[PDB]
Curated annotation (Swiss-Prot), chains A, B:
Additional note from the record: There are 3 duplications of SRGAP2 in the human genome as a result of segmental gene duplications. SRGAP2C is the only one to be fixed at a diploid state in the human genome. Moreover, SRGAP2C is functional, interacts with and inhibits SRGAP2 and is human-specific. The appearance of SRGAP2C in the human genome is estimated to 2,4 million years ago, which corresponds to the beginning of neocortex expansion in human evolution and it may have played an important role in this process through its interaction with SRGAP2 function.
Comment block on domains: The F-BAR domain mediates oligomerization, binds membranes, and induces plasma membrane protrusions.
Name of the protein in its database record: SLIT-ROBO Rho GTPase-activating protein 2
Covered range of the whole protein: 8 to 481 of 1071
Superkingdom classification of source: Eukaryota
F-BAR domain ranges (all copies): 15-270
Coiled coil: 307-346
Membrane-crossing residue ranges in chain numbering: none
Its job: Postsynaptic RAC1 GTPase activating protein (GAP) that plays a key role in neuronal morphogenesis and migration mainly during development of the cerebral cortex. Regulates excitatory and inhibitory synapse maturation and density in cortical pyramidal neurons.
Organism: Homo sapiens
Amino acid sequence: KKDKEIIAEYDTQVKEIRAQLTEQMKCLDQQCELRVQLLQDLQDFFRKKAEIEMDYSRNLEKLAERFLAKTNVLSPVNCWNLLLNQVKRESRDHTTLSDIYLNNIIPRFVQVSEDSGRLFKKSKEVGQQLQDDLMKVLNELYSVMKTYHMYNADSISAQSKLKEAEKQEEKKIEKMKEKRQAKYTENKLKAIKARNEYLLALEATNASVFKYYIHDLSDLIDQCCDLGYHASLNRALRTFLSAELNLEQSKHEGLDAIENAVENLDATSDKQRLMEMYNNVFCPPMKFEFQPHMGDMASQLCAQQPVQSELVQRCQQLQSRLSTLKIENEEVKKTMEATLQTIQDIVTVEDFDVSDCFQYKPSIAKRRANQQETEQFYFTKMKEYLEGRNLITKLQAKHDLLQKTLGES
Amino acid sequence: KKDKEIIAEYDTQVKEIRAQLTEQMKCLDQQCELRVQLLQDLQDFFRKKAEIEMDYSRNLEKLAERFLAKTNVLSPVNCWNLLLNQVKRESRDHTTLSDIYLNNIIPRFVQVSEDSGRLFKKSKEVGQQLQDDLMKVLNELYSVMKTYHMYNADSISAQSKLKEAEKQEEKKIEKMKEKRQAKYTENKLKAIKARNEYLLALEATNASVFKYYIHDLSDLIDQCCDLGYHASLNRALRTFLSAELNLEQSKHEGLDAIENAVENLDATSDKQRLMEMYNNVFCPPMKFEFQPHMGDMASQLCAQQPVQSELVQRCQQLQSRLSTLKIENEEVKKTMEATLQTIQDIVTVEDFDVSDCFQYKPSIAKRRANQQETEQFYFTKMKEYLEGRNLITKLQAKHDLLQKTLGES
C-alpha cells in the first residue's frame, strides 16, 4: 500500500460525503417548498370554499326572501312556515362558516407560511454549522495520516540500514555503527506515537460521523416540526371541524322543528281553527219557533180524543219504521267505514325512507287507477248514507215529540 | 199577528239561510285555492331548491377537481387528502338531494294538486246535494203554515157566528141554528189537526237544520282531508326529512375521517417516512477504517513502556474532563428543554372551539413578538448544545479506546 494509494482512498470517500451533505440541504429545500405549497393549497382552497359558501348562502336567502316577500295559522301552513324559517337559518349559518374560513382559518396559514419560511432558514443555519463542524474532523485526519506515513517510512528506513551494518560487521567500525540503534529506537518510538495518534484520530472521526448521521440529522429533522408544525395544524383543522360541527347542530335543531310541526299535523285541530276564523259563515241560525195565528192560545200537541188513538197508531208504527231504517243505514255506514279505511291504508304507507338513494315497476299505473275507483265508490256510499240520514232526522223529530206528549198507550 | 206578518218573518229568516249556504260554498272555494296555492308554493320552492343544490354540487366538484387535476404519504398530506375527498363526497350527496327534490318530492305535489282539485269538486257535489235537501224541508213549511193559518181563521169564523146565534135566540129558529155547532166542532177538529201537523213540521225542520250545521257541515269539512290530506303531506315532508338526515350521516362519516387523520398527525411517523423515501440521501456512509502503510503489522494501540504511563496520565485526566463538560452541557440542555416546552405551551392551545361564532384585544401584537424572542433564544441554546456535543464525542471516543487497551492503573 503506497503513500498516495491511502490518501486517494480517503479523498474519494470524503468527496462523496461533501456530495452527500450538499444533497441533504437540497433535500430540506424540497420539503420547505412542499410545506409552503400545502399551506398555499390550503389558502386558495378555503379562499374558494368561502366564496362558494357565501354564494350558497346568498341563493338560500334569495329563495327564503322571495317566498317571504309575499308575506291563526293551520298545521300544513305551519309546516310550510318552518320550511322557510329553516332555509333562512341555514343560510345565516353558511355566511358565518365562510367568515370562519377567512378571518380564522386562513390567517393561520399565512402565519405558518411565514413560519415555515423563517424556521427553515434558521434550521439550515444550524445545518450548515453542523456540516462545517464535521468537515473539520474529516480534513483533520488528512494531516494525521500524512504524519503517520512519514514516521512509519523513516522507521523502516533506519531498519534497512541496521540490517546492512550487521551484515558487514557481524578497529572502530563496530563502535561507529552503534548510533544506528540509537536512531532506530528513536524512529520506532516516534512511529509508535504517530500510529497511536492516527488510531485515536480514526476512533474520533468514526464517532463524529456516527453522531452526525444518527443523532444530529434526526434531531434537526424534528427541529423544524417540534417547531410545532403538527401543533399549529391541529388547531387550524379543529377550527374547521368545530365550524362544521356547529353547522351540524344548528341544521339539526331547525330540522327537528319541522319534524315536530309534522307531529303535532292534526285534522281535528284544522277543523276547529277553520270554524273559529269564519264564525259568521258557519254560524248556526235561530231555530224556527212556533208562531201563533191571531193570538192562538194553544202551543203544544192537542192529544185530545179522538186524535189520541190516531197518535197512538202513528207513534207505535214510527217506532218500528225508524228501527228498520237505522238497521240498514248502518249495516251502509259499515261499508262506508270499510271503504274509508281502504283508502286510508293506501295513503298511510311508509314510503319516505330514502336511505337506498345514498347507498353506493309497471304495476304503479294500476294502483293509482285502483285508488280512484275506491274514492268514486266512497262518495256513492256517502251520498247514500247522508240521504238516508236526512229522513231519519225528520222521522225521529216527529216521533220524539209524539212520545213526550203521550208515550205508548 | 196577521196572516202575512208570519209568512214575511219566516221568509226573511230563509233568505238569510240561502245567503249563508251560498257563502259556505264560497268559503270552500277559498280553501281550495289555498290548498292548490300551498302545493304550488311547495312545487316552485323545491324546483328552485333543487336548482340551488345542484349549483352548490357543481362548484364543490369544480373545487375538488381543480386540486385533483394537479394529482408514501405523510400525515399532513393525508389530512389534505381527506379534506379534498370530503368535498368530492359532499357534492355527490347534494346531486342526490336535488334528485330526491325533483323525482320524489315534487311528483307528490303535482298529484295532490290534482287530488285537491278533483276531491273538492266531488265534495261540493255532496255539498250542493245536502243544501238542496235542506232547502226542501225549509220550503215544505211554507205550505204547512199556510194550511194552519187558513184552518185557524175558519175555526174563529164559525166561533163568531155561533156567539151571535146564541145572542138572538138564547118556532124553528132555535132548530135552524143547530148546524152552527155541527160546523164549529168540524172546523175546530180540522184546526187542531193543522196545528198538530204544523207543530210536528216545526220539530222536523228544527232538527233538520240542526243536523246540517252541526253534523253534515263538520263531516264534510273532514271529508276532503280524511281524504288523507294530512296523510299525503306526512309522507312528502318525511321524504325530505329522510333526505336531509341521510346527508347528515354522510357528511358526519367523512368528517370523522378527517378528524381521525388529525389524531393518528404524528411527528415520529413523519420522521421515519421521510427517511424511508430518501434512503440514499440520509445514507450513513462507510466508517473510516485503519489503513496500514507499506503493510504495517500493528493494528491496535501499542501501550508498551514507556508510553503506558503517558496513556495512564491522559486517560485519568480525560475522565474528569469529560465529566466536567457533561455536567455543564446538560445543566444547557435543561434550559433548551425548558425553552422548547415554553414554545410548545404557546402552540398547544385550545383555540379551535368556534361555538361562540354561531350564538345569537390589543395584546395580540405583544404575544406574537414574544414567540419570536423565545425561538431566537432556543436556537442560540441549540447551537450552544450541539457545538458542545461535538467535542464530547471526539473526547469520549479517544477515552473509550484508551480504556479497552488498558483501564486505569
